[PDB]
């Protein structure tokens, strides 16, 4: 059943993967309202689709800036993977298009805000709260990894909370479809596996490492390896001496010792049993895995929901007007977008 | 404490990924 869900899912992903959707909207179909977040090449805005009156989250990327930083391949990956996937806890792409100056990805709007904001505000989540989120990630990485996708950027910043209090993963900008091995140093310092830092070649197991970081940070209030500068973070990660807060249950600590594990013959998620090594862990024993997938578990936290168009769960950012040039920029580099 | 050191650190805001 788990095996034939993943086989249908792979067949659906692969037809979209080999023939991506292109040019399914235009900028003038949307009213731009407010910036929900930023990145290297631009921003994500709340928009309103004028024809239906539906709200969406539109990513706008400046093509010239992508080229200046040598990240063309990353942004093609983001859109090609997003358009192809389908899972309850992945933010859904509704449309995508490009013009002379920019690339656009219109996603569902997830109004509860970033896990990061609620975590920093609250301080830390209880084990049951953290577990509820962790399960959704476990099931998401099961799906993505079955498609030969590595995510490579798990962190509370990239986990949105939706109106029922469930997770939607965003930010596929570092995601990559790979059988075998890959080498780029990428991700967030605090979330990186040792093998990434040491330029060893790595695979999907880095995402399971990242999950250990996230669980640790959700439950502690702070990450297992931190310092003011990235180079000192790396140094703490390669030593691999994790200190656990005294309030951590003995089961949590044991799970964490198996995810934050430098040795890839011992790291959960990677091994022969696979993801079952995680699902059947004792920390997860109260977890009804099928009920998480079906969204029948009641979330420990529903964010305030102030009607559509409301952004009170997001921080404020400086707005900047979209400029569209009359000449086509970087047409050939972005032709498949 | 570890919590105090984290809260006094320069890394409690949004983290950027590296390339
Ligand atoms: C290799 O570097 C890359 C790769 C791909 C990219 O798209 C980018 C970006 O330029 C870029 C631009 C804006 C953003 C904004 C992301 C925001 C805010 C940062 C924290 N993650 C949450 C994300 N918010 C949403 O996506 C969102 C979606 C749906 N509903 C509400 C919010 C991310 C990447 C990039 F820099």
Tab-separated table of N, CA and C in Angstrom, chain A residues 185-286:
chain	number	residue	atom	x	y	z
A	185	UNK	N	28.515	22.713	-2.154
A	185	UNK	CA	28.360	23.261	-0.824
A	185	UNK	C	27.136	24.163	-0.812
A	186	UNK	N	25.994	23.648	-0.381
A	186	UNK	CA	24.866	24.515	-0.189
A	186	UNK	C	23.915	24.102	0.945
A	187	UNK	N	23.207	25.110	1.422
A	187	UNK	CA	22.322	24.999	2.559
A	187	UNK	C	22.646	26.067	3.585
A	188	UNK	N	21.993	25.961	4.721
A	188	UNK	CA	22.204	26.889	5.782
A	188	UNK	C	23.241	26.324	6.750
A	189	UNK	N	24.233	27.113	7.129
A	189	UNK	CA	25.312	26.596	7.971
A	189	UNK	C	24.863	25.670	9.077
A	190	UNK	N	23.911	26.078	9.908
A	190	UNK	CA	23.491	25.297	11.095
A	190	UNK	C	22.833	23.934	10.722
A	191	UNK	N	22.408	23.784	9.471
A	191	UNK	CA	21.638	22.605	9.043
A	191	UNK	C	22.518	21.651	8.246
A	192	UNK	N	23.737	22.043	7.937
A	192	UNK	CA	24.596	21.204	7.074
A	192	UNK	C	25.144	19.946	7.742
A	193	UNK	N	25.056	18.847	7.011
A	193	UNK	CA	25.734	17.611	7.385
A	193	UNK	C	27.285	17.722	7.287
A	194	UNK	N	27.992	16.959	8.105
A	194	UNK	CA	29.451	16.959	8.095
A	194	UNK	C	30.022	16.683	6.716
A	195	UNK	N	29.495	15.654	6.079
A	195	UNK	CA	29.942	15.324	4.739
A	195	UNK	C	29.771	16.466	3.718
A	196	UNK	N	28.833	17.391	3.912
A	196	UNK	CA	28.746	18.501	2.958
A	196	UNK	C	29.901	19.422	3.221
A	197	UNK	N	30.116	19.744	4.497
A	197	UNK	CA	31.203	20.642	4.909
A	197	UNK	C	32.598	20.133	4.484
A	198	UNK	N	32.760	18.823	4.403
A	198	UNK	CA	34.046	18.234	4.126
A	198	UNK	C	34.228	17.852	2.666
A	199	UNK	N	33.325	18.303	1.797
A	199	UNK	CA	33.405	18.123	0.331
A	199	UNK	C	33.598	16.675	-0.080
A	200	UNK	N	32.751	15.781	0.418
A	200	UNK	CA	32.942	14.344	0.286
A	200	UNK	C	32.109	13.757	-0.839
A	201	UNK	N	31.193	14.558	-1.379
A	201	UNK	CA	30.155	13.997	-2.203
A	201	UNK	C	29.097	13.591	-1.203
A	202	UNK	N	27.841	13.840	-1.515
A	202	UNK	CA	26.793	13.474	-0.567
A	202	UNK	C	25.517	13.110	-1.280
A	203	UNK	N	24.576	12.578	-0.510
A	203	UNK	CA	23.267	12.200	-1.043
A	203	UNK	C	22.117	12.574	-0.077
A	204	UNK	N	20.955	11.951	-0.291
A	204	UNK	CA	19.718	12.194	0.447
A	204	UNK	C	19.887	12.187	1.979
A	205	UNK	N	20.924	11.519	2.492
A	205	UNK	CA	21.105	11.382	3.926
A	205	UNK	C	21.359	12.706	4.605
A	206	UNK	N	21.772	13.719	3.833
A	206	UNK	CA	21.957	15.069	4.378
A	206	UNK	C	20.625	15.664	4.827
A	207	UNK	N	19.542	15.319	4.133
A	207	UNK	CA	18.217	15.774	4.516
A	207	UNK	C	17.787	15.135	5.871
A	208	UNK	N	18.190	13.894	6.122
A	208	UNK	CA	17.877	13.261	7.381
A	208	UNK	C	18.687	13.862	8.489
A	209	UNK	N	19.917	14.310	8.180
A	209	UNK	CA	20.703	15.058	9.136
A	209	UNK	C	19.986	16.340	9.464
A	210	UNK	N	19.563	17.052	8.422
A	210	UNK	CA	18.885	18.313	8.608
A	210	UNK	C	17.651	18.097	9.477
A	211	UNK	N	16.973	16.951	9.347
A	211	UNK	CA	15.766	16.737	10.159
A	211	UNK	C	16.109	16.653	11.642
A	212	UNK	N	17.260	16.081	11.979
A	212	UNK	CA	17.751	16.015	13.348
A	212	UNK	C	17.997	17.420	13.857
A	213	UNK	N	18.600	18.273	13.039
A	213	UNK	CA	18.763	19.675	13.424
A	213	UNK	C	17.427	20.336	13.750
A	214	UNK	N	16.446	20.155	12.880
A	214	UNK	CA	15.167	20.840	13.009
A	214	UNK	C	14.413	20.364	14.260
A	215	UNK	N	14.392	19.063	14.485
A	215	UNK	CA	13.723	18.525	15.660
A	215	UNK	C	14.402	19.083	16.899
A	216	UNK	N	15.728	19.073	16.889
A	216	UNK	CA	16.478	19.596	18.020
A	216	UNK	C	16.100	21.072	18.264
A	217	UNK	N	16.183	21.898	17.226
A	217	UNK	CA	15.771	23.307	17.315
A	217	UNK	C	14.280	23.545	17.696
A	218	UNK	N	13.372	22.749	17.189
A	218	UNK	CA	11.976	22.920	17.599
A	218	UNK	C	11.806	22.679	19.093
A	219	UNK	N	12.522	21.705	19.630
A	219	UNK	CA	12.295	21.208	20.991
A	219	UNK	C	13.126	21.947	22.055
A	220	UNK	N	14.200	22.602	21.624
A	220	UNK	CA	15.161	23.298	22.475
A	220	UNK	C	14.973	24.789	22.448
A	221	UNK	N	14.552	25.320	21.297
A	221	UNK	CA	14.462	26.754	21.069
A	221	UNK	C	15.656	27.274	20.303
A	222	UNK	N	16.722	26.460	20.215
A	222	UNK	CA	17.970	26.854	19.521
A	222	UNK	C	18.610	25.639	18.836
A	223	UNK	N	19.462	25.849	17.831
A	223	UNK	CA	19.994	24.724	17.065
A	223	UNK	C	21.096	24.014	17.847
A	224	UNK	N	21.405	22.774	17.511
A	224	UNK	CA	22.483	22.021	18.194
A	224	UNK	C	23.895	22.567	17.974
A	225	UNK	N	24.120	23.295	16.885
A	225	UNK	CA	25.436	23.873	16.594
A	225	UNK	C	25.236	25.283	16.193
A	226	UNK	N	25.635	26.192	17.062
A	226	UNK	CA	25.555	27.603	16.686
A	226	UNK	C	26.709	28.453	17.168
A	227	UNK	N	26.900	29.565	16.460
A	227	UNK	CA	27.933	30.575	16.831
A	227	UNK	C	27.771	31.788	15.956
A	228	UNK	N	28.485	32.872	16.247
A	228	UNK	CA	28.225	34.151	15.542
A	228	UNK	C	28.661	34.141	14.069
A	229	UNK	N	29.613	33.287	13.726
A	229	UNK	CA	30.164	33.217	12.366
A	229	UNK	C	30.042	31.793	11.830
A	230	UNK	N	29.735	31.653	10.534
A	230	UNK	CA	29.626	30.344	9.882
A	230	UNK	C	30.808	29.399	10.033
A	231	UNK	N	32.025	29.910	9.965
A	231	UNK	CA	33.191	29.031	10.059
A	231	UNK	C	33.246	28.287	11.409
A	232	UNK	N	32.755	28.923	12.480
A	232	UNK	CA	32.778	28.320	13.821
A	232	UNK	C	31.611	27.279	13.961
A	233	UNK	N	30.544	27.482	13.197
A	233	UNK	CA	29.450	26.549	13.115
A	233	UNK	C	29.934	25.250	12.509
A	234	UNK	N	30.641	25.365	11.388
A	234	UNK	CA	31.211	24.194	10.702
A	234	UNK	C	32.089	23.387	11.635
A	235	UNK	N	32.958	24.076	12.355
A	235	UNK	CA	33.891	23.457	13.301
A	235	UNK	C	33.159	22.666	14.390
A	236	UNK	N	32.055	23.210	14.918
A	236	UNK	CA	31.237	22.469	15.897
A	236	UNK	C	30.521	21.284	15.273
A	237	UNK	N	30.066	21.433	14.021
A	237	UNK	CA	29.418	20.318	13.341
A	237	UNK	C	30.405	19.160	13.086
A	238	UNK	N	31.645	19.446	12.666
A	238	UNK	CA	32.568	18.343	12.345
A	238	UNK	C	33.114	17.631	13.621
A	239	UNK	N	33.339	18.368	14.715
A	239	UNK	CA	33.601	17.739	16.044
A	239	UNK	C	32.541	16.709	16.418
A	240	UNK	N	31.268	17.089	16.187
A	240	UNK	CA	30.107	16.273	16.547
A	240	UNK	C	30.186	15.847	18.016
A	241	UNK	N	29.927	16.838	18.862
A	241	UNK	CA	29.661	16.642	20.273
A	241	UNK	C	28.396	17.453	20.482
A	242	UNK	N	27.268	16.764	20.496
A	242	UNK	CA	25.989	17.393	20.724
A	242	UNK	C	25.678	17.356	22.224
A	243	UNK	N	25.212	18.494	22.727
A	243	UNK	CA	24.732	18.668	24.087
A	243	UNK	C	23.221	18.858	23.977
A	244	UNK	N	22.512	18.106	24.803
A	244	UNK	CA	21.059	18.102	24.828
A	244	UNK	C	20.554	18.861	26.060
A	245	UNK	N	19.502	19.655	25.955
A	245	UNK	CA	18.974	20.281	27.165
A	245	UNK	C	18.470	19.187	28.113
A	246	UNK	N	18.496	19.445	29.425
A	246	UNK	CA	18.082	18.436	30.426
A	246	UNK	C	16.608	18.065	30.332
A	247	UNK	N	15.776	18.985	29.851
A	247	UNK	CA	14.379	18.654	29.600
A	247	UNK	C	14.045	17.699	28.430
A	248	UNK	N	15.034	17.341	27.599
A	248	UNK	CA	14.782	16.448	26.472
A	248	UNK	C	14.508	15.020	27.014
A	249	UNK	N	13.431	14.383	26.565
A	249	UNK	CA	13.148	12.992	26.950
A	249	UNK	C	14.279	12.103	26.463
A	250	UNK	N	14.430	10.954	27.120
A	250	UNK	CA	15.455	10.014	26.731
A	250	UNK	C	15.185	9.466	25.308
A	251	UNK	N	13.928	9.300	24.916
A	251	UNK	CA	13.619	8.898	23.553
A	251	UNK	C	14.085	9.975	22.491
A	252	UNK	N	13.841	11.263	22.759
A	252	UNK	CA	14.201	12.341	21.837
A	252	UNK	C	15.691	12.288	21.614
A	253	UNK	N	16.431	12.212	22.704
A	253	UNK	CA	17.880	12.229	22.653
A	253	UNK	C	18.414	11.062	21.847
A	254	UNK	N	17.747	9.917	21.969
A	254	UNK	CA	18.149	8.741	21.243
A	254	UNK	C	17.896	8.867	19.725
A	255	UNK	N	16.691	9.252	19.348
A	255	UNK	CA	16.404	9.634	17.965
A	255	UNK	C	17.430	10.634	17.396
A	256	UNK	N	17.749	11.676	18.170
A	256	UNK	CA	18.638	12.739	17.707
A	256	UNK	C	20.024	12.186	17.505
A	257	UNK	N	20.432	11.256	18.378
A	257	UNK	CA	21.765	10.671	18.279
A	257	UNK	C	21.868	9.844	16.990
A	258	UNK	N	20.745	9.314	16.522
A	258	UNK	CA	20.712	8.574	15.275
A	258	UNK	C	20.497	9.399	13.956
A	259	UNK	N	20.001	10.635	14.074
A	259	UNK	CA	19.885	11.533	12.930
A	259	UNK	C	21.159	12.408	12.810
A	260	UNK	N	21.605	13.020	13.908
A	260	UNK	CA	22.875	13.768	14.005
A	260	UNK	C	24.042	12.797	14.166
A	261	UNK	N	24.187	11.925	13.184
A	261	UNK	CA	25.129	10.828	13.238
A	261	UNK	C	26.107	11.015	12.076
A	262	UNK	N	27.383	11.301	12.355
A	262	UNK	CA	28.413	11.472	11.322
A	262	UNK	C	28.646	10.235	10.436
A	263	UNK	N	28.478	9.049	11.008
A	263	UNK	CA	28.707	7.796	10.283
A	263	UNK	C	27.488	7.390	9.446
A	264	UNK	N	27.630	7.357	8.122
A	264	UNK	CA	26.489	7.063	7.233
A	264	UNK	C	26.025	5.610	7.233
A	265	UNK	N	26.837	4.697	7.780
A	265	UNK	CA	26.354	3.327	7.983
A	265	UNK	C	25.403	3.243	9.165
A	266	UNK	N	25.392	4.252	10.039
A	266	UNK	CA	24.512	4.285	11.241
A	266	UNK	C	23.342	5.303	11.242
A	267	UNK	N	23.373	6.277	10.317
A	267	UNK	CA	22.363	7.340	10.254
A	267	UNK	C	21.002	6.842	9.789
A	268	UNK	N	19.994	7.035	10.634
A	268	UNK	CA	18.600	6.787	10.262
A	268	UNK	C	18.190	7.518	8.989
A	269	UNK	N	17.300	6.866	8.248
A	269	UNK	CA	16.760	7.350	6.997
A	269	UNK	C	17.492	6.773	5.797
A	270	UNK	N	18.777	6.476	5.979
A	270	UNK	CA	19.722	6.041	4.931
A	270	UNK	C	19.787	4.501	4.765
A	271	UNK	N	19.612	3.810	5.894
A	271	UNK	CA	19.987	2.417	6.068
A	271	UNK	C	19.044	1.492	5.319
A	272	UNK	N	19.145	0.179	5.619
A	272	UNK	CA	18.430	-0.875	4.884
A	272	UNK	C	16.938	-0.816	5.179
A	273	UNK	N	16.573	-0.693	6.451
A	273	UNK	CA	15.169	-0.476	6.822
A	273	UNK	C	14.628	0.848	6.275
A	274	UNK	N	15.527	1.803	6.032
A	274	UNK	CA	15.131	3.078	5.445
A	274	UNK	C	14.422	4.014	6.415
A	275	UNK	N	13.317	4.602	5.953
A	275	UNK	CA	12.519	5.566	6.722
A	275	UNK	C	11.757	4.890	7.904
A	276	UNK	N	11.562	3.588	7.800
A	276	UNK	CA	10.986	2.831	8.897
A	276	UNK	C	11.792	2.870	10.164
A	277	UNK	N	13.102	3.046	10.056
A	277	UNK	CA	13.960	3.212	11.232
A	277	UNK	C	13.585	4.437	12.063
A	278	UNK	N	13.069	5.456	11.363
A	278	UNK	CA	12.516	6.674	11.961
A	278	UNK	C	11.058	6.520	12.449
A	279	UNK	N	10.189	6.008	11.583
A	279	UNK	CA	8.762	5.885	11.874
A	279	UNK	C	8.466	4.970	13.059
A	280	UNK	N	9.264	3.915	13.192
A	280	UNK	CA	9.084	2.904	14.231
A	280	UNK	C	9.983	3.213	15.440
A	281	UNK	N	10.550	4.419	15.501
A	281	UNK	CA	11.295	4.796	16.688
A	281	UNK	C	10.314	5.000	17.829
A	282	UNK	N	10.808	4.836	19.052
A	282	UNK	CA	9.988	5.001	20.221
A	282	UNK	C	9.503	6.450	20.387
A	283	UNK	N	10.311	7.451	20.018
A	283	UNK	CA	9.856	8.853	20.128
A	283	UNK	C	8.613	9.065	19.305
A	284	UNK	N	8.461	8.277	18.255
A	284	UNK	CA	7.292	8.382	17.379
A	284	UNK	C	6.156	7.402	17.682
A	285	UNK	N	6.155	6.714	18.829
A	285	UNK	CA	5.173	5.636	19.050
A	285	UNK	C	3.701	6.082	19.133
A	286	UNK	N	3.441	7.285	19.655
A	286	UNK	CA	2.074	7.846	19.624
A	286	UNK	C	1.670	8.395	18.259
